[PDB]
Amino acid sequence: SDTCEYCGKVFKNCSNLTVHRRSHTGERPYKCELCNYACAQSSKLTRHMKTHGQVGKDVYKCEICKMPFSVYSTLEKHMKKWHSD
DNA sequence: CGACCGCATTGGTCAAGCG
DNA sequence: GCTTGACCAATGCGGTCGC
Ligand SMILES: [Zn+2]
Ligand SMILES: [Zn+2]
Ligand SMILES: [Zn+2]
């Protein structure tokens, strides 16, 4: 009840197995409300949420896409990939 | 051009810690 | 049992530099 049905890795914390398993089945239920980011770990999505704005720092929003960033240096990454026009 | 180099972000991993 | 976050390496970029 603790081993991966797909490759047989053995987990002593079974919750680790339920997350690992999605590496095979591709399920990504933790979906960001701010972008199309998704992941198989609740931990990761909250960590990714920092990238959308810190509490004490000035936030940067996409002028086209209303999307908020905390660091400018990844906004234009979103400009190039999503706003080529 | 190609190969280095700093950074913001990430995927994988793990297990303390809970009460 | 289950959540949470630290850790690490990988990534990808943008830029730099190289008998
Ligand atoms: Zn597996
Ligand atoms: Zn997001
Ligand atoms: Zn945008």
Side-chain angles (χ1 to χ4, degrees), chain A residues 36-53 56 59-62:
Chain A
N36 58 304
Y37 169 91
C39 56
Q41 204 166 12
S42 323
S43 176
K44 297 288 185 292
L45 160 60
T46 67
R47 178 183 80 180
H48 152 87
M49 276 307 335
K50 148 63 207 65
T51 65
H52 288 293
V59 48
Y60 312 76
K61 311 222 174 118
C62 166

Side-chain angles (χ1 to χ4, degrees), chain A residues 3-9 11 17 20-21 23-24:
Chain A
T3 309
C4 181
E5 312 88 357
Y6 286 163
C7 55
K9 314 173 174 99
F11 295 77
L17 156 79
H20 157 76
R21 106 179 284 173
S23 208
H24 312 302

Side-chain angles (χ1 to χ4, degrees), chain A residues 2-36:
Chain A
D2 84 88
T3 309
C4 181
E5 312 88 357
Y6 286 163
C7 55
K9 314 173 174 99
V10 153
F11 295 77
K12 62 215 194 205
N13 168 331
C14 307
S15 291
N16 290 162
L17 156 79
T18 36
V19 160
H20 157 76
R21 106 179 284 173
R22 292 192 197 111
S23 208
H24 312 302
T25 175
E27 163 179 283
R28 287 181 291 141
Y30 306 116
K31 215 284 182 302
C32 180
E33 305 207 48
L34 287 208
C35 54
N36 58 304

Side-chain angles (χ1 to χ4, degrees), chain A residues 62 64-65 67 78-79 83:
Chain A
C62 166
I64 316 86
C65 91
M67 149 156 282
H78 156 76
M79 308 342 290
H83 303 304

